[PDB]
Assembly symmetry: C2
Homo-oligomer: 267 residues x 2
Amino acid sequence: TDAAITAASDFAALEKACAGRLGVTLLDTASGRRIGHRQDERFPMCSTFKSMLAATVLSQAERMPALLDRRVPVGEADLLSHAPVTRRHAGKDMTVRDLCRATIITSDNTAANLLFGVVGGPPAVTAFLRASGDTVSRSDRLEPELNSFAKGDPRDTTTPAAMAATLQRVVLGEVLQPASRQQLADWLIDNETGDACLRAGLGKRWRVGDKTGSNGEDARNDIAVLWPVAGGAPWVLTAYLQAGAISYEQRASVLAQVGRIADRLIG
Amino acid sequence: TANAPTDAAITAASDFAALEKACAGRLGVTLLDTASGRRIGHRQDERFPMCSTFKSMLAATVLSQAERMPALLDRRVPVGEADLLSHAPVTRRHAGKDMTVRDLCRATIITSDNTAANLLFGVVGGPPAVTAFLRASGDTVSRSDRLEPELNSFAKGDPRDTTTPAAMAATLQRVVLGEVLQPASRQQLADWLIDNETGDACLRAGLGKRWRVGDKTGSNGEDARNDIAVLWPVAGGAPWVLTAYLQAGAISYEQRASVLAQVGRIADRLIG
């Protein structure tokens, strides 16, 4: 129940309260120390992969800067469910840069597929991940098929620990040039879809950038970079959950509770 | 001339003059057919406060300068706690760090963000740079004079930060649809207008599905509520421009939006 979610003082109790499978990594970027729960098990990325699709675009634009201003057409036939920004531009076109922003802050699925076309598909995103040092996460399909998950099928999956290390390297490290990583961070900070997830459980001391993901079966995820507003080293927090026995809304509550527990662990 | 305006009298009005009488206000409208140049309207040459509608031209000014220094759009500007104003829905998230000029442009068009507008004035040379851009584009009427939030103040006979419906309609045509900016600039500006999030209850509420609409609103805490828009026919054809400026202090803030929605309904009937 809702009461059991709210009473949970550690990740195992939280997982038991929703009868699900929860994967979490909390990473202190100053020390490299991590606090995890099932952090090496695979979970479907769902829309959390869009953060790295955008990063792949920025990385390609470092060698061809006009790429971000290139315009790609949006057709009525390309519209998928949940395409809030691209739907306004059907019959005309959008810049690659505005497609990146849209796919991160509203999770627009049509934007994502158009950007896959621009960067060279799931192999391009996988190549960027490997190049960045991540040998675990992988992109294999487009929207909306990538949201499918089956135990033992590693397509479009990551682990909480791998994704936390990758967020650190790509958003905070040297994989991208400073201008590119700052643009990516700003999009994560402007995210609109995560207000009921990790952000709901985190206190005012953090500036948060995050990207959510979900599918229609049982998965609800949120990955985040937390910058201390007062200054200091950021933390990274990834949270992946599969819990088919509770409602969509209750899955957000579980993620909010992850944020509350994490905030206590950092102190 | 209404002694006690109601929602019902507003939605019953079928022409601009009757709509003005129903809300006991002062309404300025210009509906411009870009293919023939003809205009239909009301008080088209009287001055009204721009309020936030000027941001469309602040963004156009930035783009015009960036055509000559392209790195300008990627320059990052710090957002300080001290820069934050009451309406800062996007810049509040970035206080203590910085934002690109391009993202500040986006924020000031599609939200109520006033801090973004002041940071951008710092980059371009202030209100005088916006006025100079307007003059070079052929507008001899519109003028930018003050920073936020003072520019939203209006007094009869004080022309600071004002325009007229006819002047702004012509300027929107030249800037959004014409050759004042380079194609890539004008398309970026159109896309920001199309993405606007503050105007759902204003002109858009009165306009039918046959139009793709970009718009920019503006209002103050006294009696002004405005919305300027470019209407592209989804099926294809020539766009129309519609500017609407309202002062109506006898009705509530929410009812001022209803008056603009009714302008939209009337206009849609007039275009046929």
